[PDB]
């Protein structure tokens, strides 16, 4: 385990997702409101899944070697298994907040699936130049998601409760900034151009992941917006 | 096929899931009620999926060799492919019975996914001691599911029709007893401590599977609880 | 890339799915109706997914070699990854058109999953004779889907708006004819009996895919049936 310099960030990531999971689980114990239960369910599942996949990376299961550039390159494939489930869940949190129509939810989740799936293919592609073709397609899918979060959702929120509008706005901004960093880290890290070494890359992803999941969740679950308006 | 002593239980399992599938399909032919159609759909799909995966194990496709303990260990991975889809379907049957809120359904299905996914990782893990780490996490996810089935669902059922309350109670009890045996069999069988040989392990899983799927389905689909109250 | 004679059909397929995707995306820009948004979302996702998987086949990622018949046989596994997601989406388009009950939708999607999953197992099976066992099970699942599209849906459509009835009828007929060709092509092509060479097989699948996705989508998205009745 300790033979990989990035182990420390995997261990920290595992611990923080674990602690985040336990905290949200305990916090959601005293919740009977059906709307709030949905948000607690979605939001607690996110670090729970991330916990399992961080642990899989820490123990070495979620790592494979991919030959490109005439080298055996360590690729943590478990990230994509995580993101495949957790990024649509995060989008669902946002979509449910603003009472998105079903068509838009399907568009988001579908685009997200394409984003992660093509990122995975890019990560495992042995022809070096083609890795960036997949990166570009995945990034286009991300750009679509970001467009919808801004020019389909933000104007929907203004027509809703002020607490849901303000909470959505914060979470939207957090999401757009944090999510946009991922293709950059991939591009310059071990999966892409290889300018940033894997240990630093792992640190960067860990900071992004904890912020995008536990940070996000802390903001969401402390908000009154997740409760139905009741007396 | 006959070169594996466990083939007989795989063959029997295949036949019983097949027959179970055909029986539920025929039985559901004369059903127009929209609620009953949901239960027939869910409940017929369960042995249909199990049929395909038993057949895959029988024909040898759903088997791989995993090196641990300095041995090549036969691991039937197809079980997890089965359970990944059939256990949430079984939980959906229960959840729909008691008209569970969406948040609770998501919690159940999500926990179930974690249960099966981590069981799969445990099954394929090459570091012997780590297999039991995954077993423990999976078992914790199972315990969460069982907690919800008792302390989130049972009190919901009492507020519903007597036929749905009584049927849920029976199916809940069947589910908790049968499902709890699976981590025990895994732990002592070829995936875990290796005390019980694979042929007996396969027998045990076959008895559990047929009971948890066809047995469960027979109880559910004979009940009046799957029909909306109509005149 | 050009080393495989079928590359031309993969390239054409990629281009046509890409163009189809862009066309539906642009066309759906000026849509606010919640019902129409659902259909645009579903129908645009279908060629988008197919685009990615055609590209994966073109670049060689979505190809593996399967030993059977004492030969190394090129099997494009990416087709199943495509179909796993796009065929239920296509069925959802049809089901939503006729306002299918949830039980029937689950039956369709479930049968479809079995159809594609067993086709995949058949495609990767190393025992030649067993490949056709999987083909038969998959074809039985297809026959179930076709039965439901005719003897569960058609009589539902007649009870609905004339525009939805007529559009459903056309799309149903297109779907039944086109989908039925797939098991035939598989059976006689490289996955099955090997009578038709892979380059021609790839052409046939490309024509079917573009017709079943872009052709289908063009018919659906030009129809008034995807809009709620409004003044
Ligand atoms: C009802 O709706 C609210 C429940 O959602 C909240 C329910 C949660 C989504 C349930 C999912 C968590 C499962 C209990 C997972 C079990 C293992 C966890 C990964 C625990 C790991 C953290 C610990 C080991 C440090
Ligand atoms: C609505 C939305 C959800 C839509 C989703 C968008 C989605 C279509 C985007 C593309 C997803 C697709 C790329 C997933 C591919 C998974 C693949 C990387 C798994 C690894 O297999 C790749 C090679 C080794 O590199 O296997 C060696 C060859 C082996 C023989 C491989 C054979 C097994 C195949 C992998 C079977 C395909 C199953 C499905 C791809 C499962 C989906 C997995 C998940 C990652 C989407
Ligand atoms: C409408 O809602 C009720 C239909 O659900 C019931 C519909 C069923 C869920 C449909 C799923 C069954 C498919 C027909 C699968 C086809 C192959 C089966 C595995 C048949 C195998 C048994 C036989 C070969 C012994
Ligand atoms: C809401 C709920 C549904 C949440 C679900 C909870 C879920 C997160 C729990 C964990 C699921 C995750 C462990 C699934 C892992 C699948 C993996 C075992 C497949 C086999 O690949 C493992 C190694 C060989 O041992 O592959 C050799 C290396 C290869 C290069 C592997 C690369 C391909 C990757 C497998 C791509 C990942 C795709 C997804 C994991 C598909 C999910 C499969 C299913 C089993 C969940
Ligand atoms: C809101 O509901 C309507 C939007 O659905 C329509 C939304 C679409 C379903 C969104 C899915 C498309 C994504 C934008 C995918 C991005 C990459 C595409 C594959 C583009 C490829 C075509 C081009 C490169 C030739
Ligand atoms: C409600 C509906 C959706 C129901 C769906 C119906 C469905 C049950 C029908 C059967 C699906 C099932 C056959 C999928 C099998 C995927 C499998 C082909 C992936 C490739 O792995 C096969 C072998 C190499 O040939 O791997 C070499 C051995 C490796 C060690 C394999 C270990 C990893 C396993 C693949 C883990 C299983 C994960 C799930 C099968 C993911 C589903 C993938 C998708 C194709 C259904
Ligand atoms: C909790 C984890 C999160 C929120 C991860 C989000 C990941 C992304 C937004 C990844 C995007 C990528 C691209 C846009 C292209 C390059 C490859 C990816 C997958 C890193
Ligand atoms: C129809 C099949 C059923 C109902 C199978 C259920 C399986 C489980 C409840 C399995 C649980 C496991 C654990 C709790 C940890 C050990 C590994 C598993 C996957 C066997
Ligand atoms: C857009 C792609 C479409 C509509 C593909 C549809 C594919 C099928 C209907 C495939 C059916 C098969 C069988 C019925 C058995 C043989 C194997 C398959 C998977 C080709
Ligand atoms: C979106 C964040 C991308 C910026 C990443 C900056 C990382 C700087 C770390 C120094 C690079 C290490 C190179 C020498 C080993
Ligand atoms: C490929 C995995 C996609 C599924 C991710 C799980 C989250 C799905 C959320 C469903 C949103 C509801 C749409 C109507
Ligand atoms: C990883 C596979 C999970 C999907 C299993 C299929 C059953 C899902 C049931 C969905 C329940 C509805 C939730 C609102
Ligand atoms: C194995 C992949 C199955 C999921 C395919 C995605 C489409 C699912 C459509 C869901 C229909 C809604 C059912 C209530
Ligand atoms: C085009 C949609 C406008 C809002 C999205 C902001 C785009 C941020 C660019 C991210 C950079 C990724 C490499
Ligand atoms: C803690 C929830 C109470 C109901 C669940 C019963 C737990 C049964 C233990 C199963 C043993 C698994 C090894
Ligand atoms: C049995 C359902 C009647 C409508 C389905 C038509 C069946 C077409 C046969 C397709 C041939 C596949 C090999
Ligand atoms: C070896 C790198 C070759 C450059 C490939 C860049 C492709 C990026 C695609 C963006 C449209
Ligand atoms: C393929 C990238 C798409 C980003 C621009 C958005 C196009 C308009 C979409 C309107 C729903
Ligand atoms: C070789 C066996 C070593 C014991 C591992 C047991 C781990 C179980 C984890 C329960 C918390
Ligand atoms: C991680 C195992 C959880 C089992 C105990 C239940 C904790 C309380 C959950 C309340 C929804
Ligand atoms: C080598 C071919 C052997 C014939 C197998 C055909 C099986 C088809 C199953 C249809 C019930
Ligand atoms: C297993 C093939 C099934 C095709 C015939 C349909 C049987 C009746 C189903 C009624 C819903
Ligand atoms: C509750 C604390 C969870 C921490 C477990 C994972 C940390 C890795 C330690 C090596
Ligand atoms: C309808 C009977 C189904 C039995 C087929 C599978 C049994 C295995 C026989 C070797
Ligand atoms: C918009 C045009 C998309 C075409 C890209 C794929 C075609 C393959 C060219 C070799
Ligand atoms: C992106 C950083 C999130 C900060 C989380 C703090 C939560 C305090 C309520
Ligand atoms: C767990 C055993 C189930 C027994 C099924 C019998 C069904 C008869 C109605
Ligand atoms: C199966 C062929 C479909 C033809 C599509 C033409 C669409 C024109 C409206
Ligand atoms: C990590 C355990 C949380 C302790 C309770 C915090 C207040 C809800
Ligand atoms: C007005 C909301 C600002 C949130 C920005 C957070 C950036 C990490
Ligand atoms: C809208 C601001 C996005 C900032 C992107 C930063 C990526 C590191
Ligand atoms: C396995 C075939 C079932 C025969 C009909 C049973 C009575 C519905
Ligand atoms: C009161 C219901 C009892 C059911 C127990 C079944 C145990 C297998
Ligand atoms: C509530 C009783 C559970 C019994 C567990 C038996 C496991 C073999
Ligand atoms: C492929 C681009 C489509 C151009 C607009 C067509 C009319 C909606
Ligand atoms: C009456 C609808 C006829 C459609 C047939 C299309 C065959 C490809
Ligand atoms: C209902 C007519 C089906 C035609 C099947 C054609 C397959 C090539
Ligand atoms: C909570 C489980 C953590 C396992 C870490 C083992 C190194």
Continuous segment of H or E residues that includes residue C73: strand C71-75
Alpha carbon distance B38, C101 (integer Å): 8
Continuous segment of H or E residues that includes residue C178: helix C162-188
Distances from the Cα of A195 to the Cα of A71, A72, A100, A190, A198, angstroms: 15, 16, 40, 7, 9
Domain total in chain A: 1
Rounded to the nearest 5°, which phi and psi values hold at B71? -130, 160
Continuous segment of H or E residues that includes residue C75: strand C71-75
Residue A21 Cα to ligand 19 midpoint, Å, equals: 22
Task: Choose the closest CB to C52 out of A117, A127, A130.
Answer: A117
Method: X-ray
Distances from the Cα of A129 to the Cα of A68, A139, B144, C76, C133, angstroms: 10, 16, 46, 22, 40
Check: CB of residue B167 under 8 Å from CB of residue B97: yes
Residue C222 Cα to ligand 31 midpoint, Å, equals: 38
Buried b (16+ CB within 10 A) or exposed e, C32-54: eeebbbbbbbbbbbbbbbbbbbb
Task: Choose the closest CB to B125 out of A36, A42, A61.
Answer: A61
* C114 touching B (Cβ < 8 Å): yes
Count the alpha carbons within 13 Å of A90 in the hemisphere toward its beta carbon: 33
Chain C neighbors of A133, CB-CB under 8 A: 55, 59
Q: Is A106–C34 a contact, with Cβ atoms under 8 angstroms apart? A: no
Instruction: Find tokens 């539902």 and name the residue.
Output: C156
Alpha carbon distance A141, A151 (integer Å): 15
Residue B28 Cα to ligand 22 midpoint, Å, equals: 10
Residue C70 Ramachandran class (φ > 0 left, ψ -120 to 50 alpha, else beta): left
Continuous segment of H or E residues that includes residue C11: helix C7-27
Check: CB of residue A182 under 8 Å from CB of residue A188: no
Q: Is B117–A52 a contact, with Cβ atoms under 8 angstroms apart? A: yes
Beta strands B64-68 and A64-68, pairing class: unpaired
Q: Is C137–B52 a contact, with Cβ atoms under 8 angstroms apart? A: yes
Q: Is B106–A42 a contact, with Cβ atoms under 8 angstroms apart? A: yes
Beta-carbon neighbour count of residue B130 at 10 Å?
A: 19
DSSP structure string for B34-76: HHHHHHHHHHHHHHHHHHHHHHHHHTTTT-EEEEETTEEEEE-
Rounded to the nearest 5°, which phi and psi values hold at B98? -100, 10
Q: What is the CATH number of the domain that holds B38?
A: 1.20.1070.10
Burial of B30 (0-12, 13-18, 19+ CB in 10 A): exposed
Check: CB of residue C197 under 8 Å from CB of residue C186: no
**Which residues, other chains included, contact A92 with Cβ-Cβ below 8 Å and sequence gap of 6+?**
A42, A105, A109
Instruction: Find tokens 């993101």 and name the residue.
Output: A83
**In testing the pocket of ligand 3, which one of B11, B29, B48, B52 has its CB within 8 Å of the most ligand atoms?**
B48
Segment B5-8 long-range contacts (CB within 8 Å, at least 24 positions apart): B5/B198, B5/B199, B6/B198, B6/B199, B6/B201, B6/B202, B6/B203, B7/B58
What is the rounded radius of gyration, in angstroms, for the C-alpha atoms of chain A?
18
Is residue C102 within 6 Å of ligand 13 at its C-beta? yes
Closest Cα to residue A84, out of A48, A111, A130, A117? Answer: A117
**In testing the pocket of ligand 14, which one of A145, A146, A182 has its CB within 8 Å of the most ligand atoms?**
A146
> Which structural domain range is residue C83 located in?
1-231
Structure tokens at A35: 């709307």
Structure tokens at A50: 């991330």
Check: CB of residue A107 under 8 Å from CB of residue C39: no
Min CA distance, A214 vs chain B (Å)?
18
What is the rounded radius of gyration, in angstroms, for the C-alpha atoms of chain B?
18
Distances from the Cα of C167 to the Cα of A201, C149, C162, C220, angstroms: 52, 14, 8, 7
* B152 touching A (Cβ < 8 Å): no
- Coil, helix or strand at residue C66: strand
Residue C175 Cα to ligand 37 midpoint, Å, equals: 10
Chain A neighbors of B102, CB-CB under 8 A: 34, 37-38
DSSP structure string for chain A: -TTSTTHHHHHHHHHHHHHHHHHHHHHTTT---HHHHHHHHHHHHHHHHHHHHHHHHHTTTT-EEEEETTEEEEE-THHHHHHHHHHHHHHHHHHHHTT--HHHHHHHHHHHHHHHHHHHHHHH-SSHHHHHHHHHHHHHHHHHHHHHHHHTSHHHHTTS-HHHHHHHHHHHHHHHHHHHHHHHHHHHSTTTT--S-HHHHHHHHHHHHHIIIIIHHHHHHTSGGGS----
Residue B89 Cα to ligand 12 midpoint, Å, equals: 7
Check: CB of residue B225 under 8 Å from CB of residue B161: yes
**In testing the pocket of ligand 35, which one of C17, C19, C26, C40 has its CB within 8 Å of the most ligand atoms?**
C26
Which resolution, in Å, applies to this structure?
Answer: 1.8
How far the first Cα of chain A sits from its last, in Å, is: 53
Residue C144 Cα to ligand 28 midpoint, Å, equals: 26
Continuous segment of H or E residues that includes residue C64: strand C64-68
Label each residue of B129-174 as H, E or C.
Answer: HHHHHHHHHHHHHHHHHHHHHHHCCHHHHCCCCHHHHHHHHHHHHH
Alpha carbon distance B193, B188 (integer Å): 5
What is the rounded radius of gyration, in angstroms, for the C-alpha atoms of chain C?
18
Residue C99 Ramachandran class (φ > 0 left, ψ -120 to 50 alpha, else beta): left
Alpha carbon distance B148, B107 (integer Å): 9
The ligand 16 atom nearest the CA atom of C150: 4
Buried b (16+ CB within 10 A) or exposed e, B150-164: eebbeebbeeeeeeb
Q: Which residue of B has its CA nearest to C119?
A: B52
Chain A neighbors of B119, CB-CB under 8 A: none
* B29 touching A (Cβ < 8 Å): no
Chains with 3 or more CB pairs closer than 8 angstroms to C?
Answer: A, B
Rounded to the nearest 5°, which phi and psi values hold at C70? 70, 20
Q: How far is CA C68 from the centre of its chain?
A: 27
Structure tokens at C226: 């995807």
Closest Cα to residue B189, out of B131, B126, B142? Answer: B131
Alpha carbon distance A117, A122 (integer Å): 9
Alpha carbon distance B114, B112 (integer Å): 5
Q: Is A102–C56 a contact, with Cβ atoms under 8 angstroms apart? A: no
Beta-carbon neighbour count of residue B214 at 10 Å?
A: 21
Task: Choose the closest CB to A104 out of C37, C39, C44.
Answer: C37
Chains with 3 or more CB pairs closer than 8 angstroms to B?
Answer: A, C
The DSSP code for C185 is: H
* A34 touching B (Cβ < 8 Å): yes
Check: CB of residue A51 under 8 Å from CB of residue A21: yes
The ligand 32 atom nearest the CA atom of B22: 1
Structure tokens at B116: 């099966």
Closest Cα to residue C182, out of C216, C145, C207? Answer: C207
Rounded to the nearest 5°, which phi and psi values hold at B66? -120, 120
Check: CB of residue B39 under 8 Å from CB of residue B220: yes
Structure tokens at A184: 């950059």
DSSP structure string for C134-171: HHHHHHHHHHHHHHHHHHTSHHHHTTS-HHHHHHHHHH
* C87 touching B (Cβ < 8 Å): no
């Amino acid at each position: 385990i300790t033979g990989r310099p990035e182990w420390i960030w995997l261990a920290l990531g595992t611990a923080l997702m674990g602690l985040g999971t336990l905290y949200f689980l305990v916090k959601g114990m005293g919740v009977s409101d059906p709307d709030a239960k949905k948000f607690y369910a979605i939001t607690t599942l996110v670090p729970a899944i991330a916990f399992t996949m961080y642990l899989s990376m820490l123990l070495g299961y979620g790592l494979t070697m991919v030959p490109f550039g005439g080298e055996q390159n360590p690729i943590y494939w478990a990230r994509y298994a995580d993101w495949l489930f957790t990024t649509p869940l995060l989008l669902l949190d946002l979509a449910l907040l603003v009472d998105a129509d079903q068509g838009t939810i399907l568009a988001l989740v579908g685009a997200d699936g394409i984003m992660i799936g093509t990122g995975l293919v890019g990560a495992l592609t042995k022809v070096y130049s083609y890795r960036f073709v997949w990166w570009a397609i995945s990034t286009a899918a991300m750009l679509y998601i970001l467009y919808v979060l801004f020019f389909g959702f933000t104007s929907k929120a203004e027509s809703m409760r002020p607490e849901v509008a303000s909470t959505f706005k914060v979470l939207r901004n957090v999401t757009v900034v944090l999510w946009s960093a991922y293709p950059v880290v991939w591009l310059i890290g071990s999966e892409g151009a290889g300018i940033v070494p894997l240990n630093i890359e792992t640190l960067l992803f860990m900071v992004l992941d904890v912020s995008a999941k536990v940070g996000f969740g802390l903001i969401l679950l402390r908000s009154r917006a997740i409760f139905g308006e009741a007396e």
